[PDB]
């Protein structure tokens, strides 16, 4: 029992000088595989970011391997929500409230594929 | 102070090779990329090598374009290959200074944009 999900409903707040993507889990099961996909036009400045016990580091457009993933037991409308720093994590400047019009306006979007087993 | 070298009019399946110059040491290990921009069009990504000499490419120029940049030289090259009438616009050379004992917002300073177009 074997399902793929991918899942593009990233929104976006802010907790002083931080960003705060968030996305629901429409279904329970226990992850097998999961990765993020960074699609943007931008550049990110270096961000660094934390999702599900895995840091990467946002330059560009990337598909990062979500690899602390692997096992974690999610619920129904369980909210896999990260936090996300420019300049590996010193939010130097208005860089991360420019990247965040670059998240609430498309421009740059998250795309979560899972491997779960319900 | 940014500026690109190369570009003009090539037909399809020619080749240019695009140079920017970066003008001081403030753009030492510094990620820049480049990016393009027709007529009606918004600026598009196109390719970016990061201050580890990485490589990101764009999907429409995947395989076809190059990156790369000589770190002592200032220099970042996009080596454009089997190239399509779409490719035609202005490539605009982009870099970002991280940090570099700045004092306001680390913003992002750009070329002036070399002129690139492929005829049929």
Redesign the interface.
């Given at each position: 029992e074997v399902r793929t999900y991918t899942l593009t409903a990233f929104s976006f707040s802010r907790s002083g000088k931080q960003i705060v993507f968030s996305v629901t889990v429409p279904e329970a099961g226990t992850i097998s595989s999961a990765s993020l996909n960074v699609i943007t036009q931008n550049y990110l400045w270096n961000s660094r970011a934390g999702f599900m016990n895995t840091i990467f580091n946002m330059t560009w457009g990337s598909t990062i391997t979500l690899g602390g993933a692997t096992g974690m037991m999610l619920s129904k409308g369980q909210i896999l929500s990260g936090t996300s720093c420019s300049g590996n994590g010193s939010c130097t400047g208005t860089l991360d409230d420019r990247i965040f019009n670059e998240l609430t306006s498309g421009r740059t979007t998250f795309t979560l594929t899972l491997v779960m087993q319900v | 102070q940014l500026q690109e070298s190369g570009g003009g009019l090539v037909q399809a399946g020619g080749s240019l090779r695009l140079s920017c110059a970066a003008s001081g040491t403030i753009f030492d290990g510094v990620?820049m990329?480049w990016?393009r921009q027709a007529p009606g069009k918004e600026?598009?990504?196109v390719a970016?090598i990061?201050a580890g000499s990485?490589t990101?490419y764009?999907d429409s120029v995947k395989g076809r374009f190059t990156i790369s940049r000589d770190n002592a030289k200032n220099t970042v090259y996009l080596q454009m290959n089997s190239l399509k009438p779409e490719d035609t616009a202005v490539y605009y050379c982009?870099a970002?200074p991280?940090?570099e004992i700045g004092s306001?917002?680390?913003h992002?300073y750009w070329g002036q944009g070399t002129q690139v177009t492929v005829s049929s």
């Open positions: - | 990620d990329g990016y600026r598009e990504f970016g990061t990485s990101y764009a982009a970002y991280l940090d306001h917002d680390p992002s």
